[PDB]
Design an enzyme around this catalytic site. Sequence first.
Site, PDB file in Angstrom:
ATOM      1  N   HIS A 191       2.243   9.504   1.805  1.00  0.00           N
ATOM      2  CA  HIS A 191       0.599   9.721   1.709  1.00  0.00           C
ATOM      3  C   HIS A 191       0.346  10.599  -0.038  1.00  0.00           C
ATOM      4  O   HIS A 191       1.196  11.232   0.353  1.00  0.00           O
ATOM      5  CB  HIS A 191      -0.428  10.188   2.447  1.00  0.00           C
ATOM      6  CG  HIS A 191      -0.053   9.240   3.405  1.00  0.00           C
ATOM      7  ND1 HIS A 191      -0.714   7.903   3.821  1.00  0.00           N
ATOM      8  CD2 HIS A 191       0.970   9.183   4.931  1.00  0.00           C
ATOM      9  CE1 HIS A 191      -0.220   6.953   4.950  1.00  0.00           C
ATOM     10  NE2 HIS A 191       0.715   8.470   5.675  1.00  0.00           N
ATOM     11  N   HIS A 242       0.653  -1.040   0.213  1.00  0.00           N
ATOM     12  CA  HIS A 242       0.006  -0.005   0.254  1.00  0.00           C
ATOM     13  C   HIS A 242       0.838   1.234  -0.012  1.00  0.00           C
ATOM     14  O   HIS A 242       0.569   2.604  -0.238  1.00  0.00           O
ATOM     15  CB  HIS A 242      -1.106   0.300   1.262  1.00  0.00           C
ATOM     16  CG  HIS A 242      -0.451  -0.093   2.722  1.00  0.00           C
ATOM     17  ND1 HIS A 242       0.243   1.330   3.308  1.00  0.00           N
ATOM     18  CD2 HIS A 242       0.098  -1.091   2.956  1.00  0.00           C
ATOM     19  CE1 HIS A 242       0.385   0.681   3.926  1.00  0.00           C
ATOM     20  NE2 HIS A 242       0.738  -0.589   4.530  1.00  0.00           N
ATOM     21  N   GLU A 246      -3.378  13.853   4.194  1.00  0.00           N
ATOM     22  CA  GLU A 246      -4.428  13.158   5.353  1.00  0.00           C
ATOM     23  C   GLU A 246      -4.931  14.511   5.561  1.00  0.00           C
ATOM     24  O   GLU A 246      -6.027  14.133   6.252  1.00  0.00           O
ATOM     25  CB  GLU A 246      -3.100  12.472   5.947  1.00  0.00           C
ATOM     26  CG  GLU A 246      -2.905  10.663   4.678  1.00  0.00           C
ATOM     27  CD  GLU A 246      -3.427   9.516   5.194  1.00  0.00           C
ATOM     28  OE1 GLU A 246      -1.837   9.662   6.721  1.00  0.00           O
ATOM     29  OE2 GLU A 246      -3.704   8.698   5.567  1.00  0.00           O
ATOM     30  N   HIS A 277       5.217  12.165   6.158  1.00  0.00           N
ATOM     31  CA  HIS A 277       5.317  11.319   7.539  1.00  0.00           C
ATOM     32  C   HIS A 277       6.323  10.940   8.397  1.00  0.00           C
ATOM     33  O   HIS A 277       7.401   9.948   7.912  1.00  0.00           O
ATOM     34  CB  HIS A 277       4.716  10.697   8.790  1.00  0.00           C
ATOM     35  CG  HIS A 277       3.034  10.518   8.344  1.00  0.00           C
ATOM     36  ND1 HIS A 277       1.845   9.751   7.767  1.00  0.00           N
ATOM     37  CD2 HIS A 277       2.699  11.836   8.173  1.00  0.00           C
ATOM     38  CE1 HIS A 277       0.687  10.561   7.915  1.00  0.00           C
ATOM     39  NE2 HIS A 277       1.020  12.550   7.851  1.00  0.00           N
ATOM     40  N   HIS A 287       7.951   8.028   5.762  1.00  0.00           N
ATOM     41  CA  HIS A 287       7.062   7.700   4.505  1.00  0.00           C
ATOM     42  C   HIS A 287       6.465   8.711   4.091  1.00  0.00           C
ATOM     43  O   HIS A 287       6.111   9.879   4.718  1.00  0.00           O
ATOM     44  CB  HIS A 287       6.227   5.747   4.563  1.00  0.00           C
ATOM     45  CG  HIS A 287       4.960   6.216   5.978  1.00  0.00           C
ATOM     46  ND1 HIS A 287       4.810   6.252   7.253  1.00  0.00           N
ATOM     47  CD2 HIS A 287       3.585   7.236   5.907  1.00  0.00           C
ATOM     48  CE1 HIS A 287       4.291   6.625   7.963  1.00  0.00           C
ATOM     49  NE2 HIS A 287       3.390   7.107   7.196  1.00  0.00           N
ATOM     50  N   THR A 331      -2.846   6.367  10.786  1.00  0.00           N
ATOM     51  CA  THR A 331      -3.753   6.661  10.155  1.00  0.00           C
ATOM     52  C   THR A 331      -4.187   5.191   9.107  1.00  0.00           C
ATOM     53  O   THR A 331      -4.473   6.072   8.384  1.00  0.00           O
ATOM     54  CB  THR A 331      -3.536   7.632   9.146  1.00  0.00           C
ATOM     55  OG1 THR A 331      -2.379   7.574   8.275  1.00  0.00           O
ATOM     56  CG2 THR A 331      -3.537   9.063   9.978  1.00  0.00           C
TER      57      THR A 331
HETATM   58 ZN   LIG Z   1       1.160   8.199   7.426  1.00  0.00          ZN
END
Ligand SMILES: [Zn+2]
Length: 258
Positions: free
Chosen positions: A94, A62, A104, A117, A92, A197
């Site tokens: 998003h 993912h 996010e 993050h 990492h 999250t």
């Molecule tokens: Zn994250």
Amino acid sequence: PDWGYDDKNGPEQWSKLYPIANGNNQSPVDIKTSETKHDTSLKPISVSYNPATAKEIINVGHSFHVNFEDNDNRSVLKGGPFSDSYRLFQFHFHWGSTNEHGSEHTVDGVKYSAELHVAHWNSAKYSSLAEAASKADGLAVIGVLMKVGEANPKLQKVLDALQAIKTKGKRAPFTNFDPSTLLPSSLDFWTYPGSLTHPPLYESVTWIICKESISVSSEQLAQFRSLLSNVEGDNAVPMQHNNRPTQPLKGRTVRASF
Ligand SMILES: [Zn+2]
């Protein structure tokens, strides 16, 4: 194994399997600048990372993660709201299906392009990350909003590494890197208590959201969206998006360091 970001197994379904998805301290959230509280006790955040702790980059299906050796206090986060130091373990990203909306957290209802993050665990209190992961004070994560614009050269080393981890389960050495190079020039921040999250969704994170964003180009985003969710040999399934929708605040306070 039982979760993704697709219609069928995505954010709107995670509650059927992880009841804490409807908990009182879920992330991400929208930050309403008119309602943040200035707290004069916040200290400036201080990061001190040793590039020699950079270890590996791995495709997790993912997303992708860059992991750091966390056997000691060579790389730590201090200050802000904290009294103890926090030991760096990972960074990492998003992103979304479009380049314009993939963050996010939001700010006054505005979704940014993507989000970085930088995750840390409480080595003062717990003996390992696995222990810390489920405790209210276990994690500290720095979130930095990314706005589509000019290309960001500070991302190149991470972009060049993706070639070696195109499919799920691949990994490669990734060394000699200081992620403080990715943060904004000023570290003015908002903070609130929240959660991971994605599953297991533990309510174990103290969030630090930088006020200042960093840039990223469309092409840079498109490279993220090119990684594959499948294992090598299988049919191709792009890592098209990995952001969760914002969650109700439920009585929480967002504090500002400024
Ligand atoms: Zn994250």
